[PDB]
Design a binder for this molecule. Sequence first.
Ligand SMILES: [Mg+2]
Ligand SMILES: [Mg+2]
Ligand SMILES: [Mg+2]
Ligand SMILES: [Mg+2]
Ligand SMILES: [Mg+2]
Ligand SMILES: [Mg+2]
Lengths: 305, 38, 67, 132, 107, 122, 192, 101
Amino acid sequence: EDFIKKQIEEFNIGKRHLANMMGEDPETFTQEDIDRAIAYLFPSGLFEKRARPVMKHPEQIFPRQRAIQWGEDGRPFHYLFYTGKQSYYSLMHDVYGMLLNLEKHQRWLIKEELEEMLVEKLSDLDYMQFIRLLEKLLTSQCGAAEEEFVQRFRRSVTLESKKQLIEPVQYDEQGMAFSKSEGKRKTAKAEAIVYKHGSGRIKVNGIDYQLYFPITQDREQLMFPFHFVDRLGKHDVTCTVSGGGRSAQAGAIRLAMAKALCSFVTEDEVEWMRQAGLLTTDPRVRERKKPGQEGARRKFTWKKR
Amino acid sequence: NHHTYAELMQTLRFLGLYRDEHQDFMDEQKRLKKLRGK
Amino acid sequence: NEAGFDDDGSEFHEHIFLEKHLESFPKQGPIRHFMELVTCGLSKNPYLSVKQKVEHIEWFRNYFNEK
Amino acid sequence: KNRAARVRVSKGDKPVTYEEAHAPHYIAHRKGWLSLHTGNLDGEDHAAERTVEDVFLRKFMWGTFPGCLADQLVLKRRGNQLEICAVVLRQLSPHKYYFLVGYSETLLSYFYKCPVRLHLQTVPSKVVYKYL
Amino acid sequence: SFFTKLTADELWKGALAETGLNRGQIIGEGRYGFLWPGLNVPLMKVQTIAQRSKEEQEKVEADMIQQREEWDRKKKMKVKRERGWSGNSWGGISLGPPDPGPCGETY
Amino acid sequence: PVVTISDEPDILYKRLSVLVKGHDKAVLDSYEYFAVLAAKELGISIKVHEPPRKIERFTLLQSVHIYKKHRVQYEMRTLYRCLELEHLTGSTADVYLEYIQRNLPEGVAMEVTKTQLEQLPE
Amino acid sequence: ALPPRTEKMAVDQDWPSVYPVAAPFKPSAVPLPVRMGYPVKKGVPMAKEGNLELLKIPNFLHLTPVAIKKHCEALKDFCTEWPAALDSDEKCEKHFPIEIDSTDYVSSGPSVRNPRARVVVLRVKLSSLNLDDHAKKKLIKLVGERYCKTTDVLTIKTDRCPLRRQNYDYAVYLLTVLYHESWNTEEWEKSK
Amino acid sequence: HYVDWRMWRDVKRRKMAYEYADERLRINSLRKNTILPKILQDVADEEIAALPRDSCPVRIRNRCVMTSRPRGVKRRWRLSRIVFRHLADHGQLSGIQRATW
RNA sequence: CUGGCGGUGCUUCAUAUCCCUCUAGAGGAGCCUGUUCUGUAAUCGAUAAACCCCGAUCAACCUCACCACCUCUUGCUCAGCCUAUAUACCGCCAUCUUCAGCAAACCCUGAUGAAGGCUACAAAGUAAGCGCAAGUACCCACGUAAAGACGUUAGGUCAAGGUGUAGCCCAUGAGGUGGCAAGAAAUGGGCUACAUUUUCUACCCCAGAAACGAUAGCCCUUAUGAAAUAAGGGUCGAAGGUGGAUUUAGCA
Ligand SMILES: [Mg+2]
Ligand SMILES: [Mg+2]
Ligand SMILES: [Mg+2]
Ligand SMILES: [Mg+2]
Ligand SMILES: [Mg+2]
Ligand SMILES: [Mg+2]
């Protein structure tokens, strides 16, 4: 235990010297100085994130353990000292006493989290018994003080994934309600300019979509979003496609058009499109060619057989 | 060429400011074999 | 990179101007064309000097039309 | 398995250093680079001669001190500066230390046409990684 | 050559092989060295400069060989363990007592 | 300064194109940060970004004696920082490069400065 | 006694008087007990003073921000003015069309001989010149891989001599001779 | 003063090909050619056919120093992959690591 | 005494890993390529399990590291050995792993013996140290290069390279000079066709031959050399009509 204090004092002297280095007047600096140091005079470069130079006051990094467990002629800090982990059992006894008191009157954390909170290494069945006792307490006459005391060991709900980042209609640049977007499909990117009016054709890369992709699958993919939203003809575009080749560019244009549509579309249809699958990028992307194999995942023939 | 370099290493060893582990070990093994030889 | 790697001087008119310094054999075969090609290759190589190129041309002309 | 530079568990208080305990797939992850030389660079060329010179210097410096170099050096080329960071151990007296250091410095500076200098590792604790 | 050579770990683990010297000559001394004023002198405060010779170096090498022979002789440190009960068997013999525990009572 | 004050005309420098080359990411980051700090202290408007990386993964086996069904490579997470100074004088850039090289990062983080003169035609 | 300038060093001392020279880490002259190393299981990094990793770092402990500011104040000299000829890569070329490259790469190892300072290109913007009456039909053919459309980039890679400044001088002389010869075009240069 | 022998063979062959510079230079420059006369070409052919071994400029095989291995060698480091891998395993090379992509 | 075993009955169960299902290269065959081994003055590495496009990111004297003639016990080495002991090593690494734990130091269970430490309405584990877990970076966190513990084949190697010990010390080293490249026989790892898919052509998809595959080898050669290897021009222009229960990766 003395080594902990020795290292703490050594690092305190080191931090004093570090503060004395700078000739400025702010002694209670924040993480800015540590960041500047790691950027200038401590660039390790190790890929890992633990062995990197993260020098910090060990007053909070060095963990703590049970201090003294006895005083004048033994005398621990509780009557459940010989039971191992006296704190947990004392808390359980207090919970049982509160249970009996309430009876007379009338999300959860993980094991590691409870261990870090306390100073005991509890198992799983003891945690289950503690949860059972807490549930019995919450059920025994629903109040307020006890409910808050029990929730202290719990967290809020914090619901996510609900609304969609509605993009503005964008009326600047020109006198047309256009909207930027993008699309990805096996390493590819684009930037479309889907207007709001213009019930006619579409200019794909400055040229009509007749001499660009005579295949019907390309036109079907291009219609995918407009057909899903039912706003077919009433749309003009002057996108600039790049990267990919055929199906990649088709999917990129499809995603760009879907995003441009969702930009200025009712929340209902926006959510329907987002849930149908035509906004994000599927995981089907140019993977890493396996060096220990002939092709992609195709391993050698008589490997295990 | 390792000729001038070998001579420099030999001179350094003679001066007592170098170490030749593999060469000395091979020389000792050769001496032992000659004693057992031939 | 100035402390060395000078390769002597050229005076911006010594390495390329090789038309006169040629010693043209009686113009009747590809020997003159080959010598011109060699001079072009030497001029396109910035790793040579005036004396080196002169000696190379002299040795080439000798080994070719010694007779 | 792979024992490129690691040492599996055995006892508890055995001798072992940082370089004497690492995996091949952790050359740049949990382990650093003991030679930040101007050789294996990109797109810059010149690597063979640089590596040869680095190996020669490392072997010479290891042969200098007798029985005091556990790990290799960490050469540093700041243009025309050869900085050595040897893991030296307190051998005997400081007079011999200074004499040998000055002799080697002068010799290398007059030979390689570049200033050379080293510094001992006066630390009462090695860079032990795994307790083993 | 030397580039193709290696350090000492491989040679040691090959000569030993358990699975299935740096002490004699000092750096100050050499096979053909001379008296270096840098070391082998007092605190140097005023010093004397001199040089050795081939005969002196040969004498020093002979002395070092004699010291190595003496060390090799000392290496044969054999002791006859008191035969307990029977020979080549851990019979009746005392080693050491048990050290005190975390509480006390010197046993 | 202490560089023999002269009165002859100087050469018209323009664009000090630089390109750092290395392997380690933290070292390149530190080098580019120090360079940007020194440039800002000197007072030169510049831009910084990240050009495409250049990695030529050479070929090699995973073992030493005999092994093909299990292969490995030795790549690198190299980066590049084009710390180009747009329009400036030659003497200041030379002094800056001198101060840089007086203590440059060993091995990795190697700069490839490049200027662009002008002078008069004929 | 006499610790490694860690405890005996006076507190709040002039640090610029500690690392003024561009020195390395110096594990014995480092009053910063920085912890470096990967943990074992559930504890603290390894040693305290000089670590192998600390040395493996490119080493920038020398010259602290205070020393950096000192070096900057020292370098404050050399304040040569620069002309504001408008960027955009237009007026700069209009003023002087030629664009020579005189770089100074950094060498490696103990050898300064770096075969890389001989790069030179006479990238002269012909469009900026615009004084070719009949030489328009002559220059277009007297050079092969040049003469663009938007901006005439006459970049005749003249790297024949073993240097840079004399290479540029010879290139300028050849360009002047070519212009003087084109001033009086030939007789059969019209029909192409 | 090498330890192995293949290293010495390579050294001797390379130095013999480098020393006799003018001879092999002219030979390789004049032999296989469809232009110019054939007299000098035949002269060079006879010269290269009559001369003994340890001179022909076709004696270049990449090998290392630590092992003198011809299989799998690169001119960038003048050593083989095994030597390169052995040096990388000890963390003695910058930028080298596992294919993390 | 606790283990290997359970074609022991059974419990958790195997997600492409297994049968029921298939997507598909290869099986009958053209080309690059070697395996059991033949041959002299042209070794090859367990050349089964982990070799047969492995070392070879490749065999004209270098590369072949293998032998003889001019000479040696200074042989370029103040000699080395690519010579050997896998029953002695350093060295890299798959395998089981697509698991699940090993134990120092303690304290207990057998009238203390080979052993074990065993289940929350709790019947002895804290467990130094090595671990999945934390991913180490990325296409985020699945998935990729590689495991993932004490270990599994006196594991491959005395020769990828060095090495205890023995032998050469008229060599199995060699200073200078001369020597292969073909499958007697079978086979498989990669590019290819049996069909309009072999040719994609001015258009990558608005217009179609031989009615077959329409090879290799050889000559002119990009390169050079004392013997061709990837392939461009000419000739041959073949081998057999998915051919054996099928084989291996795949839950995008
Ligand atoms: Mg074997
Ligand atoms: Mg494995
Ligand atoms: Mg993991
Ligand atoms: Mg992997
Ligand atoms: Mg074995
Ligand atoms: Mg022989």
